[PDB]
Design a binder for this molecule. Structure first.
Ligand SMILES: COC(=O)C1=C(C)NC(C)=C([N+](=O)[O-])[C@H]1c1ccccc1C(F)(F)F
Lengths: 48, 48, 100, 49, 48, 50, 50
């Protein structure tokens, strides 16, 4: 009962930033480097 | 290879889990970066 | 595709019957059966008593992959039948145990 | 009729979309087992021979 | 009066041990103790 | 081994000439365990052993 | 066999000492060969010096 005005502030803050991110970063992370001619993603051994 | 004496020469890694696609690398006896080997390293491990 | 209950009794009945065809053209020399499996809770003592009471057949059991299933029964089967036991955890371990 | 090239099985299908450019798969080890009824045209008077 | 509360407190402790000894297995496979512990479920289900 | 970029994976034991004189001919019979527990990394390994 | 024959290499693993042979070219072998000794093939994942 004391920590509810906080939990409604956290919630609307996750709503604010989620929407901003959606506008700003929507559909932007869909290109990686591949091996030429192939469907094999190229990374270094410790790289994600 | 379970002892340092056997951990010599070369082994095969298999990229993308594929037993047709493998490369040759040297095997090496490696120590963990955080260990409990003396008391002072053990305090560094436990701080982490 | 893997699906369903493990049964080492219907697996070694089917194996022995296959081994006894004698109508087909055959090598008729070393008769051996090798099973690839991870862990076994049943030793199937009954199937080996009759099908190979005199141990004509040789049984090799292979435990593969990194897993926690019990390997004692499989080792026992190998020991009972004058076969051998081989683990394979890895792809680089396949080449020297399937020739050994 | 016997030739140096290995005896082949099936229609060869390799996927170009999944072969890395520098890993070197196994080439071949099979024996060259051509049969007499496959080196020459088969008869019934040759299966007797 | 007294022991009715201490027999169901050890009956529930046995149901909680029964849950914790169950071994989840992939792709509709089982062992023998998972078979006997689902026949032990009918006991706790008839006591409660 | 490493002076070109193709690397030999040739084993004498594996060789057919080595094998015929290693041992006598044989009627084998591979059993494969296909129960649910095997599915995963282990199932992948079996197809490559056989 | 399968080692660089270049004289200036000199790896010299412990336990072992190599040979630089002289390698005449030949017929009945369609490759250069030495008749003074036998080569040795060690497979690749096997360490030599064990
Ligand atoms: C000496 O203690 C330490 O090594 C510490 C360890 C190993 N862990 C971390 C994160 C600490 N730190 O620098 O904040 C101190 C620690 C930790 C818990 C409470 C108090 C302290 C104190 F060191 F600040 F007292």
């Amino acid at each position: 009962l004391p920590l509810f005005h906080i939990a409604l502030l956290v919630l609307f803050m996750v709503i604010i930033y989620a929407i901003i991110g959606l506008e700003l970063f929507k559909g932007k992370m869909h290109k990686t480097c591949y091996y030429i001619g192939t469907d094999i993603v190229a990374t270094v051994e410790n790289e994600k | 290879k379970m002892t340092e004496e056997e951990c010599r020469g070369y082994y095969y890694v298999y990229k993308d889990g594929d037993p047709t696609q493998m490369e040759l690398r040297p095997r090496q006896w490696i120590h963990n970066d955080f260990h409990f080997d003396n008391v002072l390293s053990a305090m560094m491990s436990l701080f982490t | 595709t893997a699906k369903g209950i493990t049964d080492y009794k219907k697996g070694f009945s089917f194996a022995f019957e296959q081994l006894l065809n004698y109508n087909v053209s055959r090598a008729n020399c070393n008769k051996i059966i090798m099973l690839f499996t991870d862990g076994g809770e049943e030793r199937a003592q009954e199937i080996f008593a009759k099908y190979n009471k005199d141990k004509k057949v040789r049984v090799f059991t292979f435990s593969v992959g990194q897993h926690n299933y019990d390997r004692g029964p499989i080792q026992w089967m190998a020991c009972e039948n004058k076969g051998y036991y081989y683990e394979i955890p890895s792809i680089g371990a396949i080449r020297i145990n399937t020739q050994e | 009729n016997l030739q140096p090239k290995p005896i082949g099985v099936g229609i060869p299908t390799i996927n170009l979309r999944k072969r890395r450019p520098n890993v070197q798969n196994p080439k071949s080890q099979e024996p060259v087992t051509l049969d007499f009824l496959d080196a020459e045209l088969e008869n019934d008077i040759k299966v007797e021979i | 009066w007294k022991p009715f509360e201490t027999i169901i407190l050890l009956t529930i402790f046995a149901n909680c041990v029964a849950l914790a000894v169950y071994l989840p297995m992939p792709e509709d496979d089982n062992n023998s103790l998972n078979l006997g512990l689902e026949k032990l479920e009918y006991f706790f289900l008839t006591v409660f | 081994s490493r002076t070109p970029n193709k690397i030999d994976l040739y084993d004498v034991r594996r060789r057919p000439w080595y094998i015929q004189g290693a041992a006598s001919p044989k009627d084998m019979l591979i059993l494969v365990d296909v129960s649910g527990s095997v599915s995963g990394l282990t199932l992948k390994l079996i197809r490559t052993s056989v | 066999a399968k080692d660089d024959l270049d004289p200036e290499k000199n790896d010299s693993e412990p336990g072992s000492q190599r040979i630089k042979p002289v390698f005449i070219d030949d017929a009945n072998f369609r490759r250069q060969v030495s008749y003074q000794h036998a080569a040795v093939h060690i497979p690749t994942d096997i360490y030599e010096g064990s």
